[PDB]
Amino acid sequence: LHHALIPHGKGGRSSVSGIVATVFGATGFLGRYVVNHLGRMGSQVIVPYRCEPYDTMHLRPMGDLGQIIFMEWNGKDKDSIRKVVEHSNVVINLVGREWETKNFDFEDVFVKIPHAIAQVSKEAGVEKLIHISHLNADIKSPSRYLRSKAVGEKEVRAAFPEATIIKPSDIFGREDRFLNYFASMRWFGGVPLISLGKETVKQPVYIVDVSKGIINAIKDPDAKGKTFAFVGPNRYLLFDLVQYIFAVAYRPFLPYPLPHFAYRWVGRLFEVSPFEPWTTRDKVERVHMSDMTLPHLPGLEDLGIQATPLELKAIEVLRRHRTYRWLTSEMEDVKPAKTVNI
Amino acid sequence: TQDTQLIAVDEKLDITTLTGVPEEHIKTRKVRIFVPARNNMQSGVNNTKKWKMEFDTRERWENPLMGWSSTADPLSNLVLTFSTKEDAVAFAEKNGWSFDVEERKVPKPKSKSYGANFSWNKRTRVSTK
Amino acid sequence: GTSVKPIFSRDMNEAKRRVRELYRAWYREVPNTVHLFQLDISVKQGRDKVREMFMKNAHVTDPRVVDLLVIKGKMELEETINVWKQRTHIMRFFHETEAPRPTDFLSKFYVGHDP
Amino acid sequence: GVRTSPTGEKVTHTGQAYDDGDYRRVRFSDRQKEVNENFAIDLIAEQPVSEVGSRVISCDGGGGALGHPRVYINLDKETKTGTCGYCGLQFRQPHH
Amino acid sequence: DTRPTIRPRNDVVHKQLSAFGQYVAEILPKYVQQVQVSCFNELEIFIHPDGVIPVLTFLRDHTNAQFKSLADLTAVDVPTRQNRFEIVYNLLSLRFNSRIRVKTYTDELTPIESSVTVYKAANWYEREIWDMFGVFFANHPDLRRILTDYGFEGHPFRKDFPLSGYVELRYDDEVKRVVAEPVELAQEFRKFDLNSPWEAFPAYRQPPE
Amino acid sequence: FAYDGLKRQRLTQPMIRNEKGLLTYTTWEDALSRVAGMLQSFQGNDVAAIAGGLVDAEALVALKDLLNRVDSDSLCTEEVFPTAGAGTDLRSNYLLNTTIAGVEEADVILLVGTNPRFEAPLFNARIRKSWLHNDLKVALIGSPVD
Amino acid sequence: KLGLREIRIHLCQRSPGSQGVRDFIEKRYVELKKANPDLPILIRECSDVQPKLWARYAFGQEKNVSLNNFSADQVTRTLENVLSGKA
Amino acid sequence: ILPGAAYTEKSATYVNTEGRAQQTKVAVTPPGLAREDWKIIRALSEIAGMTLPYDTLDQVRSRLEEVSPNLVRYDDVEGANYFQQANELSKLVNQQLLADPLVPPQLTIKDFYMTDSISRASQTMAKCVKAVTEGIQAVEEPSIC
Numbered sequence A: 001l002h003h004a005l006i007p008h009g010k011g012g013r014s015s016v017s018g019i020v021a022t023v024f025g026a027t028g029f030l031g032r033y034v035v036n037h038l039g040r041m042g043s044q045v046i047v048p049y050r051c052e053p054y055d056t057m058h059l060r061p062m063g064d065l066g067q068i069i070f071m072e073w074n075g076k077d078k079d080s081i082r083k084v085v086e087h088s089n090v091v092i093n094l095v096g097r098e099w100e101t102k103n104f105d106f107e108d109v110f111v112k113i114p115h116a117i118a119q120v121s122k123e124a125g126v127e128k129l130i131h132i133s134h135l136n137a138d139i140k141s142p143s144r145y146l147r148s149k150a151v152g153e154k155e156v157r158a159a160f161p162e163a164t165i166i167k168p169s170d171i172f173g174r175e176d177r178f179l180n181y182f183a184s185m186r187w188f189g190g191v192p193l194i195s196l197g198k199e200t201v202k203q204p205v206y207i208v209d210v211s212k213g214i215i216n217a218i219k220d221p222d223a224k225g226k227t228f229a230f231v232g233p234n235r236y237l238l239f240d241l242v243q244y245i246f247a248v249a250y251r252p253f254l255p256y257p258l259p260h261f262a263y264r265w266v267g268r269l270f271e272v273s274p275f276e277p278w279t280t281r282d283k284v285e286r287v288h289m290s291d292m293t294l295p296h297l298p299g300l301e302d303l304g305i306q307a308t309p310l311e312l313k314a315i316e317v318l319r320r321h322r323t324y325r326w327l328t329s330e331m332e333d334v335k336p337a338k339t340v341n342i
Numbered sequence B: 001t002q003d004t005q006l007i008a009v010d011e012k013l014d015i016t017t018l019t020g021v022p023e024e025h026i027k028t029r030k031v032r033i034f035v036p037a038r039n040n041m042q043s044g045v046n047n048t049k050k051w052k053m054e055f056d057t058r059e060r061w062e063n064p065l066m067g068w069s070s071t072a073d074p075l076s077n078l079v080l081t082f083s084t085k086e087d088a089v090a091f092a093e094k095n096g097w098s099f100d101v102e103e104r105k106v107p108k109p110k111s112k113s114y115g116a117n118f119s120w121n122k123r124t125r126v127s128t129k
Numbered sequence C: 001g002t003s004v005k006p007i008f009s010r011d012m013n014e015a016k017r018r019v020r021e022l023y024r025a026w027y028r029e030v031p032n033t034v035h036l037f038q039l040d041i042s043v044k045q046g047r048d049k050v051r052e053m054f055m056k057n058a059h060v061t062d063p064r065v066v067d068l069l070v071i072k073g074k075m076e077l078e079e080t081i082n083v084w085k086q087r088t089h090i091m092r093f094f095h096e097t098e099a100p101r102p103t104d105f106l107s108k109f110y111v112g113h114d115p
Numbered sequence D: 001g002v003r004t005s006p007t008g009e010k011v012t013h014t015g016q017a018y019d020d021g022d023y024r025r026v027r028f029s030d031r032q033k034e035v036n037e038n039f040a041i042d043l044i045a046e047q048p049v050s051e052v053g054s055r056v057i058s059c060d061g062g063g064g065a066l067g068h069p070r071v072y073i074n075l076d077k078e079t080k081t082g083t084c085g086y087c088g089l090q091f092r093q094p095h096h
Numbered sequence E: 001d002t003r004p005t006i007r008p009r010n011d012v013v014h015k016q017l018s019a020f021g022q023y024v025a026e027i028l029p030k031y032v033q034q035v036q037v038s039c040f041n042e043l044e045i046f047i048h049p050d051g052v053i054p055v056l057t058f059l060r061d062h063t064n065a066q067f068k069s070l071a072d073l074t075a076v077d078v079p080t081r082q083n084r085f086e087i088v089y090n091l092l093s094l095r096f097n098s099r100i101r102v103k104t105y106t107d108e109l110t111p112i113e114s115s116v117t118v119y120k121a122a123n124w125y126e127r128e129i130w131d132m133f134g135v136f137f138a139n140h141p142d143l144r145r146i147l148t149d150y151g152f153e154g155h156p157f158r159k160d161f162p163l164s165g166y167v168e169l170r171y172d173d174e175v176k177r178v179v180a181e182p183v184e185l186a187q188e189f190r191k192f193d194l195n196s197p198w199e200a201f202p203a204y205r206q207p208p209e
Numbered sequence F: 001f002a003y004d005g006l007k008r009q010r011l012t013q014p015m016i017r018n019e020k021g022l023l024t025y026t027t028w029e030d031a032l033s034r035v036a037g038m039l040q041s042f043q044g045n046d047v048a049a050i051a052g053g054l055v056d057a058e059a060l061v062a063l064k065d066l067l068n069r070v071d072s073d074s075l076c077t078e079e080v081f082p083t084a085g086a087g088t089d090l091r092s093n094y095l096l097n098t099t100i101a102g103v104e105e106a107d108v109i110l111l112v113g114t115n116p117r118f119e120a121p122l123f124n125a126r127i128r129k130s131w132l133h134n135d136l137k138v139a140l141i142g143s144p145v146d
Numbered sequence G: 001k002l003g004l005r006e007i008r009i010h011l012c013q014r015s016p017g018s019q020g021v022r023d024f025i026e027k028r029y030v031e032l033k034k035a036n037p038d039l040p041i042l043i044r045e046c047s048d049v050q051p052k053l054w055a056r057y058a059f060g061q062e063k064n065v066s067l068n069n070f071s072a073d074q075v076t077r078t079l080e081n082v083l084s085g086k087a
Numbered sequence H: 001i002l003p004g005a006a007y008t009e010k011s012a013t014y015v016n017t018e019g020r021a022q023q024t025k026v027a028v029t030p031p032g033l034a035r036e037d038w039k040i041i042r043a044l045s046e047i048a049g050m051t052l053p054y055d056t057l058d059q060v061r062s063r064l065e066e067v068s069p070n071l072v073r074y075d076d077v078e079g080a081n082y083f084q085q086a087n088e089l090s091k092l093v094n095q096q097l098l099a100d101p102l103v104p105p106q107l108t109i110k111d112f113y114m115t116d117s118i119s120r121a122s123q124t125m126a127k128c129v130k131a132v133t134e135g136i137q138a139v140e141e142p143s144i145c
Ligand SMILES: NC(=O)C1=CN([C@@H]2O[C@H](COP(=O)(O)OP(=O)(O)OC[C@H]3O[C@@H](n4cnc5c(N)ncnc54)[C@H](OP(=O)(O)O)[C@@H]3O)[C@@H](O)[C@H]2O)C=CC1
Pocket: A024, A025, A026, A027, A028, A029, A030, A031, A032, A049, A050, A051, A075, A094, A095, A096, A097, A098, A104, A109, A132, A133, A134, A135, A167, A168, A169, A170, A171, A178
């Protein structure tokens, strides 16, 4: 091992764990908690950013002084990744957008950027690399999202034969835009769902389980090469998802059956918005399509991670969206939805 | 000695539950006491008159950004003053600290005879003063 | 002599009473504590987190120490009635964010020189 | 005078240089490991050695009160040149 | 003093305070143990713990003393004694412009009758002392923490309490509010054992033992 | 003057033979498994141990009980002793029985095959003080080293 | 296995309980060691310790037996029984 | 390679030549990944299968108590005796004495310096080796500052 790299201290803010993290796109939900755990135990974290440094300031109070270093970086410019990943031990890829922008397409951020980050990291000579791809990554999937993850996973697998690809099923949390999605749905009158959402079962997993699983994969000496899939502890129908979360918000649930094409159209008008889109046609397919089960792929329990139940952590997000009439209502009042778990 | 509803609670004092130092720092801390030894280049034996309480030196790692000796044990610089050793151990029992006792290394009472520096047969005579 | 003056609990029995109404106040305090204090933990884990602290101090035989502790018990209790503490203040009892402490000999050997 | 390490970074006056395999160097990326150009090693050797004609000399360091406390250095060793530890400048006998 | 370096003396006051020192001694022989006036004209009354409330009452009430001002409450902790904490009061007599010091001793467990009744100023001074040192007094109105952090465990001023504390806190985004953790300093307190190894004062030296 | 030695050539991390048979730094896991894998499979005189010249007693107990459970009694030491006779049995056979303070009351000392002036400098200072004040006689059997 | 490897006869130089075992080793020792040249007879004489016999068997086994106030003949009786179970 | 710990980096007990137990205490933490020497073995015993009962410093300290009560009374010596038995126990086949003269391994200052691993690793101690074996020329460092 490197001479000035041996772990030291009792896993604190000022301790030394020996991990030179290089999380990319940490200015997001997964990045926010990943740098938190890395900073918490004590590890040098190199965070490249593309957006305004002001938005990245909320990661400043996340580690000891000189442990978090912010670096400018660009996806297209190869030299940008080289500077970030040169003095590194683990480079983990968290870059990727749920929608499409004019400069960066779906394949650009999910295949091209992962292709660049994997090739440079291997060429630089980092010992480990972790890549994030959707658990539903499928080449024939109707959504360009999941197709891009599949080919992107294939590319980083070939370029980096020791990369530990991560397969989260459906992430949820405070700023998760997954249950915040259905929570924000009450604004547009009722709750539009395709065929009332009775033919879609998902298995969401909360942030800390996948987040802790990341560093556990970093600490795991045998995690290289594997394709761990981080999945939740329970499976519920899509109708049960909206039923439960609206109940925790106590907002009046108004089920609204929709044809598939009308919902596809609705994403089109909402994609026109020059600002950040609310609903996209790709998001239409993702919420419509159902989560798949991959028992052969190792799960999250193999890394000593217990999948937190959705009902236990759903209140942490639903409190913000609920009204004053039930703001102080607890979580025992609501009852977890019908689990159709495997 | 002052009879005010006195009850014979003669069990060893256990103030650890009240002072509430963390579990790692009440069991896994060998508290040791001695009398400090006088610095040899000094001639200051008066500093060897007090019983002193110490701890065990834990990990002292170097800071990445500068190189420091960041410590994780709060009881690193803590030393305590005791007139006699029985008071020092008495504090250890009430604070339930695993105690170790050394003894006061009193100096030998050496006999100095300057007249012996110039003898007729004894080897103690000095070749140069 | 070794005989000492008690404050309130002359022996174990009255001290055992004093730890009992602490439970009496605490048990009906946890429900509306979560309710008022905007807490996201349920009553179930609220109740037993009052529990294990009784066994956290379930070894002292001196009545005074139990009495010295009974005052602090209602002190933290009263501090919770009138919202004096903040969310983090009571969260400090809920050990939640620290790394788990190693227990078996293999773990501390693999961690460092910690004895 | 400042040298350059094999990794391309200037070495400090104390001789400290970051190893090429070191990870903490990245703090120098987009920044500088600035080094005091006036090396105290090279800032005192070229000062002339004085040739006072006396056995013992009081060195003050210049400026009187502003200099270092007065130190009485000795000049009897012919092979070695006397010097004041406070300042480091040289002293010498008048060639005797 | 023809020499302008050393501090002068007020022998008239020193004897005068000493006369009042023995004055209190006969008045309350049950409670006082020894009364001493220091070289720098500071006469201290040393009273028994259980008689804390009467002596303070006597000084507040008696015409010849009339000490009605609770200047300060201190309980200086000395680990070498059996009952470590020695509780020290501080009184000022306005009519006789003189200061008196009455003090007791009390271990970590022995309770003292609160002097709030005899001195309303003792109230908040009482809330501080139990916080810093941990000596509970009896029947205090609202004896409760008023200095340390809400729920901060342990009395910080105790000798066994390290100056750096036991816990430190830091904001955490994964829970979105501040949270505590064991203290782990960037720089430890570098102890400076600078005490001179040579005797400094022959006058105050303890007898051989 | 030995603190500088504590800074030179320090064993920092476990090292095991690589694919080419060269020592390379590795984690404790591989080193522990490799030694354990080669230990429990061997028994009797196959497993042995040699103590150093500066090893502490607690380590010696550790190997004594470790080789206890593997049927190994070949726990050798660098120092060699004529075990014939009492040897290890009687502690008076090898102990400085009179204690180092005893020289200041002796009369004659026989140094057999040793250089206490160099082997044990603190010892030789004690005889020197004894020879100075007590006029204690000395005589050795060995090379006439000063 | 359960065979003799060495003995550890801990005793005190002054305790009356250790006097009996002390009575044993003044004269009845040279024949015991000569009878078991391979068996080392370790005498750990630490003060204020009641005499303890420690027979270390194979496989990391070590049984103890009391010798408090055991006179010269009877300390020989119990240790010979340990010798009798040499395997 | 099993990185142990030096005496300054170890809180353990040695015994002098007179059979007096003296315990050292840790002053500097062992560098890097090195751990306590006995902590290594106890970890080794657990990973091998024949786990030792003792796991902390006091537990192993009690182990030397039950195998050798002498080396736990710190600074307290124990009077050695039964020399009347040791000599009569030697008393045997009487192997002869070699004609080789008695030559101590340490005869000069130089070989006295170069004994143990720490002395071998040390550099300033090696400067003293150069001083005695050569003289004053090379070893004279200019004491300018
Ligand atoms: N249910 C889900 O949402 C699932 C998501 N994932 C993937 O895991 C990751 C989680 O991201 P999350 O932390 O939630 O952040 P977001 O998805 O909310 O935002 C994207 C993240 O990547 C960065 N980023 C976005 N676009 C680019 C770009 N073109 N170039 C470089 N960086 C970019 C963002 O910072 P910035 O905008 O400043 O560049 C931010 O850190 C994403 O890749 C996501 O697709 C995987 C499985 C499930």
